[PDB]
């Protein structure tokens, strides 16, 4: 049997994966998800993508590990610049709009948006930064808008010679090539077990059994024991309660506030009574200090 905490909330994946509008790449929308149960099997039903792309974990192994916090970054980029969404990437988007630490442990989902982000006249509500003095630091965004200067003389607020605007509007058309179609991109970043975790799948704490010698791994504690009801008054927020031997005897449950008692499974020694070997081979077996009912 095993332990899991008291999480009953459901993580809101519906609002992030589809909201009829997406933030620009230069200003990517970031949401924090925690204190809920995340069902990643329903993600396929929200966005029309092909397959996951995870680096630190596997797409089929996201419903077992329990993480502290989840970060979701959503934006829309060009078709050919999806390749720039990868660890240690180099490019305009890589160092000017979105930078990712090289130790990224998460997933990236990108899928086409030609039917919503393209207009016959031409979409212009999405912009990306073109010029920047320095490459972007990991997990850093830029919102400030100004006139970039590439000359000795100051720009003086007029876009004259040696004065540029580092905000280029994306050109999206329904007749454009595949590498130029607008694509919605969502990057999910996970935090490992550094603080009490809050996001993982809803598997019961093995439906707590009673009156049986049982193996267990309770919250990293490996052992065996017999579990029975309890008559002790554990105060509101105790998790483990020990004895004179400094070993646990009464226990709570992180999936339902219940008070339970622990005992060691019965065990004993075996003795054999025999006459002389030269006399006969018959033997008698005795179990030391055990009532003649269990055996």
């Amino acid at each position: 049997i095993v332990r899991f905490p008291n999480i009953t909330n459901l993580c809101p994946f519906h609002e992030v994966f589809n909201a009829t509008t997406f933030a620009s790449v230069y200003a990517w929308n970031r949401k924090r998800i925690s204190n809920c149960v995340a069902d990643y099997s329903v993600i396929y039903n929200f966005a029309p993508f092909f397959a996951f792309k995870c680096y630190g974990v596997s797409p089929t192994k996201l419903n077992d590990l329990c993480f502290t916090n989840v970060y979701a970054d959503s934006f829309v980029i060009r078709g050919n610049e999806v390749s720039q969404i990868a660890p240690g990437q180099t490019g305009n988007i890589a160092d000017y709009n979105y930078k990712l630490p090289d130790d990224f442990t998460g997933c990236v989902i990108a899928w086409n948006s030609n039917k919503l982000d393209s207009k016959p006249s031409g979409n212009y509500n999405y912009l990306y930064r073109l010029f920047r003095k320095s490459k972007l630091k990991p997990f850093e965004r830029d919102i400030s808008t100004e006139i970039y200067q590439a000359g000795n003389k100051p720009c003086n607020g007029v876009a004259g010679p040696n004065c540029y605007s580092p905000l280029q509007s994306y050109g999206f058309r329904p007749t454009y090539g595949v590498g130029h179609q607008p694509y919605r991109v969502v990057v999910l970043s996970f935090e490992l077990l550094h603080a009490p975790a809050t996001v993982c799948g809803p598997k019961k704490s093995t439906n707590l059994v009673k009156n049986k010698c049982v193996n267990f791994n309770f919250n990293g504690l490996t052992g065996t024991g017999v579990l029975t009801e309890s008559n002790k008054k554990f105060l509101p927020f105790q998790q483990f309660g020990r004895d004179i031997a400094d070993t646990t005897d009464a226990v709570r449950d992180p999936q339902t506030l219940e008070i339970l008692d622990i005992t060691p499974c019965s065990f004993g020694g075996v003795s054999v009574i025999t006459p002389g070997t030269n006399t006969s081979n018959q033997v008698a077996v005795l179990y030391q200090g055990v009532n003649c009912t269990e055996v």
Partner: nanobody
Framework: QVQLQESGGGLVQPGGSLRLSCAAS????????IGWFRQAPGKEREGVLC????????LYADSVKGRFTISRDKDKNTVYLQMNSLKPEDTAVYYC??????????????????????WGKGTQVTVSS
């Protein structure tokens, strides 16, 4: 998400004053050029006045130069219009509009006229004459 609603108007005598304001809710564009438009019954709607968003470079039409005063406040994301010495030809259906700034030649330039992304429901301003 983005909505443009206007308030104010009515019927006033010639030479009077009125205040018109259109509130922008849910706007997310960093750089944009919002404009105000009017259309008298039987005439095409035309641009009237507009200012820049970054610093407030004011622009006016010849027919409403001086008589029309505008101010943009970023606290409420609402633009306020001041009209004084109203004249009979000013009777029209007044609208508020919002659109993003054009990006050409690597610069920040605000453009009005046509090609506006968003529009309001409009209001009626009448002069007794």
């Amino acid at each position: 998400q983005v909505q443009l609603q206007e308030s104010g108007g009515g019927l006033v005598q010639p030479g009077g004053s009125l205040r018109l304001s259109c509130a922008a809710s849910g706007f997310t564009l960093d750089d944009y050029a919002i404009g105000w438009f009017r259309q008298a019954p039987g005439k095409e709607r035309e641009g009237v006045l507009c200012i820049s968003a970054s610093g407030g470079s004011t622009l006016y039409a010849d027919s409403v130069k001086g008589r029309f005063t505008i101010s943009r406040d970023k606290d409420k994301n609402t633009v306020y219009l001041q009209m004084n010495s109203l004249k009979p030809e000013d009777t029209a259906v007044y609208y508020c509009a919002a659109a993003g700034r054009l990006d050409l030649g690597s610069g920040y330039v605000c453009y009005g006229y046509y090609g506006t992304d968003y529009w309001g429901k409009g209001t009626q301003v009448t002069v007794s004459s």
